[PDB]
Design a protein around this nucleic acid. Structure first.
Lengths: 174, 30, 245
RNA sequence: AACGCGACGAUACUACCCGCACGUUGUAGACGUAUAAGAAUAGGCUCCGGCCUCGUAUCCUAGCAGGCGAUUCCUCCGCCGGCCUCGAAGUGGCCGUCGGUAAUUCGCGUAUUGCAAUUUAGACACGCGCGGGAUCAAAUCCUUUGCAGACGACUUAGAUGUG
RNA sequence: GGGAUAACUGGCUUGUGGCGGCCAAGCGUAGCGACGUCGCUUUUUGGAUGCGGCUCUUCCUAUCAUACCGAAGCAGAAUUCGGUAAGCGUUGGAUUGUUCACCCACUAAUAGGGAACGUGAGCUGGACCGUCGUGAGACAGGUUA
RNA sequence: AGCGAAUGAACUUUAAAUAUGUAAGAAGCCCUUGUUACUUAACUGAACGUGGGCAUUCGAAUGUAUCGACACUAGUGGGCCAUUUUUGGUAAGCAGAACUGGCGAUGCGGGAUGAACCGAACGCGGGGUUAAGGUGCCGGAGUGGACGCUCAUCAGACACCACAAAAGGCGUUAGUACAUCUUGACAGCAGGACGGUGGCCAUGGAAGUCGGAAUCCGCUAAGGACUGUGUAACAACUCACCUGCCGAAUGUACUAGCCCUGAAAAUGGAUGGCGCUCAAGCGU
RNA sequence: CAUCGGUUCUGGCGGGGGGAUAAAGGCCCAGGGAAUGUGGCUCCUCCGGGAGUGUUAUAGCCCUGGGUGUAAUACCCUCGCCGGGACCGAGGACCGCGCUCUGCAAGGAUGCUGGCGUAAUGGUCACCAGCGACCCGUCUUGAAACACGGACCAAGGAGUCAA
């Protein structure tokens, strides 16, 4: 949601006399900016291990972007979302040109279809499907159907919204 | 409808089991 | 999603078999192959095939298999790499449709003589052409549709009334008797179930079966056989002209 | 519908119509206040070639707020008549006369409103004038009636008569 | 005698009891647990009640009648249960302090309710002091809204 | 967290969150020896004094719109609501303590409207920018943009407390698990659905199908001592199951959205009103 | 209107820096790979269109490493330079800080010009229009609501004096 780019965040527990050179954990997340990146990094480490913001430091934050954002990819997203009944696994697919666009579409689709929120959605694993055989969903699969061509019936013309009155009745053909 | 569906499900389960397979009144009356 | 039909769960004692049945069919055919000297492939094109029981009882010492054509074909082996014996992959070429296997320790001439002398009158079955025109006489209708003499026939049943009406005979229930027209048989023309040289429908065939009238013939065609000693297949007169695989 | 509408009759003054002089007269607001197919939008239009996202289109659009004269043009307006047309709350076509008119070019005049000051300019309405035509009415009070009536109101009669 | 509280209901209310056992998808990792079924109430021969009543306007449907439908051994007739319907109508007697139930006569039938803490409009049928007592009350004693 | 440290909320190396008491200087600490009527076996301790030490960071940060003492004078002695913590209780209400905030004495913008909600505090004016709330005029600002979902016989437009349940839905979309499929799955159509056997008992009659109990075998491709219709009893049809034709994905239970139901009376009325349906409804 | 000062809104242009010294991409180079399989070959109810073997061929695509390359661009952060608009002009010799110093945009607006010089600006009344807006006081309570007083006007009228 918003404008997102890939962030890798590496962080570690503060060095001590007992445990110098700590474990130096890392993970990749999706945030509008580095502030939210760091905040959710500390959130997930607090949830997983016994590392807090007070006793930890951000070793590195790096913006990772798409290698080839001018080529069309299919992405499989495996995620957890918690509703009033509990936490559920879902695997969906998105035909996009970048992982950030795929996650944009995923958040929009979650909000539209299951009323899930940003803190209610956990993104476990987003993958680029290597082969077309790996597509499991009929919508993207019909988009990857061979020799795909379709018309665009009933296109309402884009008339300037201040053009209140028109003399000719508009057409919906081209 | 709830009662009917429960009865039908019980009948289906009992039939599946049986196809796979090959006192207080007394004291009160006394 | 929703808006779907409700499949009925039958309160039944026998269920679907599937894979275990397929496997035991393979096993039975494969254990039967070495026991017998010849394997005949026969065809029963458009017949009811309930007389196969009498065929088995006559040929007790011969093993007859009547299963799915593809399962039988692969049990015998369709290719000369997975064949159980030699030429059996050339007999799976004759295993095409409504066919069956007959493992025999007998003589091919005796088998062809039996299957050319065996012939049983049977009900028409759909798709057959009518040899004759069957017409139900106008008036009081009997249990044969006016084929046996009326003096030697019994009235048809009032529980067959609705089925006859559904199948399309304009009959009536007059004073406890089924009547086509009136009891006088003077107010209606008869009912021609089937006409000569006209392909019968399932409606007409079911009417003929209800009236117990047989217009077709049950005979087994012998497409070919295979001898294990020579490891060789023989083409017979019938198998000369049949859609092959 | 007592602040919705229509047809018809008769309308003395007043002003009832016309011509044109205007108004130190009103307006919920001229300033090119220009533009008629029907019908579909998973179709349509046509000149029958073709064309349709698109009205950022078409017409009209120059001259002392638009003068005078000429070369040149038969084009666009306008007013009257004649024949006809338009009734959903009523208009337009053709023809005829007469009047104006850059499609091209030119001459004579614009000044001084002084460096901007609504470019007072349209329409409908109403009033006051002139000179041309036309017309000479009703209602109320009053008396009376009882088909009416608390009282107003209503149905009647009252000019010569079937009073 | 002192202290607290001083009204109260206001998406309230209606048709299906409570208790214990068995089963029980689940939640959970013992405890909560519906629909059913069993045991008690409960079975082997057929008066209750201690503010009421009448007229008129309008509305609701939770419909007694009239209209139309679905089902029922619904032969016919007479009906029973249910559905849409408020367009149109909707009592009297006996008895009782009153009402209801039952019971009895007409009638097509002789339904039930609201008018919002004043049940639409109209009509009709006491507490403070004083004295004397206190195993307990009395006062033509006084005062008071 | 661990018990590859010991021991076993009552275990611990360590140690959360959360509020909360006290102390943070010359208004200081000591050390040293003179006196005392106190005290000690004693110039020995305690108190009263002397000398020293730091006056420049004099001994955390940030602020400081000064603080203290004495004397005198006026109006006050009520509480209501809400958050969090906590005690008890009911079928549900609810009752009581602690802190804090709002209101009393407070105007203004917004929530259509208003004690308790949100924003924000107030001299008279001009300009600019915002908040909460909004941008289909009424009404200033979008019939703004992207992706989806929903059609309700009085939808919904922030109420999510109640009715409300393990509820009903052959509405719609997304998803989880399990299962069957070119060894041909689901649906259909054409056919088989047989023999011992009218199995035993019972019945006037009961042959799979008024009833009790067992419920096996053969043939098998498969067929129940039978799932319904039917006969007085048969007969007959049909289902289970099987094969042929067809040809590629299906079908069972759950989960999550939006939608219908999940109960309503009585003057005519209310998302504020119009109206709104690829919204002017719902989510981001 | 011109030149300035203060506040502010809004367009445009020229540079610098940082990421993966952006990621990509174009053109080269070296390798590897597959299909939603390009040419070829096989079959195919032949305007036509499918199935199969078949890795660049008469299309191409994906992946890894290298060169142009310190490429461009997006995003973010930055140093400046031009244009358009609105509101305002407090003060009244010099002093001061300064600069781009014959002067200046530097401790607050001057210069030029036009019309009118009178109801023209301005003001007071009455009405219309858009927006806003409970009837005062007393009393009670935490607050409302209730309750109480109020037909109007003139004059009088209530913390004084002494110890």
């Amino acid at each position: 949601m918003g404008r997102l780019q890939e962030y890798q965040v590496i962080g570690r527990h503060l060095p001590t006399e007992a445990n110098p050179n700590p474990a130096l954990y890392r993970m990749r997340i999706f945030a509008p900016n580095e502030v939210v990146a760091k905040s959710r990094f500390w959130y997930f480490l607090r949830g997983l291990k016994k590392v807090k913001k007070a006793t930890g430091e951000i070793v590195s934050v790096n913006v990772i972007s798409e290698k080839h954002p001018l080529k069309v990819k299919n992405f499989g997203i495996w995620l957890r979302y918690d509703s009033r009944s509990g936490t559920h696994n879902m695997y969906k697919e998105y035909r996009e040109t970048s992982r950030v666009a795929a996650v944009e579409a995923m958040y929009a689709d979650m909000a539209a279809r299951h009323r899930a929120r940003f803190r209610s959605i956990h993104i476990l694993k987003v993958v680029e499907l290597e082969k077309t055989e790996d597509v499991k969903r009929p919508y993207i699969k019909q988009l990857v159907a061979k020799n795909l061509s379709f018309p665009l019936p009933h296109r309402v013309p884009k008339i300037s919204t201040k053009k209140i009155f028109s003399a000719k009745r508009p057409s919906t053909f081209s | 409808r709830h009662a009917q569906k429960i009865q039908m499900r019980k009948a289906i389960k009992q039939h599946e089991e049986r196809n796979v397979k090959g006192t207080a009144k007394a004291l009160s009356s006394q | 999603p929703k808006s779907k039909r409700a499949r009925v769960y039958h309160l039944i004692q026998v269920n679907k078999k599937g894979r275990e049945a397929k496997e035991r069919l393979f096993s039975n055919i494969r254990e039967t192959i070495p026991k017998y000297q010849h394997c005949f492939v026969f065809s029963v094109d458009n017949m009811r095939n309930n007389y196969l029981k009498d065929v088995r009882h006559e040929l007790n010492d011969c093993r007859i298999f009547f299963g799915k054509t593809k399962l039988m074909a692969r049990a015998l082996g369709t290719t000369p790499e997975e064949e159980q014996a030699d030429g059996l992959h050339r007999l799976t070429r004759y295993l095409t449709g409504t066919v069956g296997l007959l493992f025999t320790n007998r003589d091919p001439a005796d088998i062809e003589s039996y299957f050319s002398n065996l012939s049983q009158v049977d009900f028409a079955r759909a798709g057959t052409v009518a040899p004759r025109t069957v017409t139900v006489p106008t008036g009081i209708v009997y249990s044969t549709g006016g084929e046996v003499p009326p003096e030697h026939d019994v009235p048809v049943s009032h529980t067959l009334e609705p089925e006859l009406r559904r199948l399309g005979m304009p009959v009536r229930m007059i004073k406890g008797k089924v009547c086509l027209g009136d009891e006088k048989g003077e107010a209606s023309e008869g009912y021609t179930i089937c006409k000569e040289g006209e392909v019968l429908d399932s409606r007409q065939t079911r009417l003929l079966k209800l009236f117990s009238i047989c217009l077709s013939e049950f005979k087994v065609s012998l497409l070919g056989y295979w001898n294990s000693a020579s490891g060789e297949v023989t083409e017979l007169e019938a198998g000369k002209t049949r859609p092959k695989r």
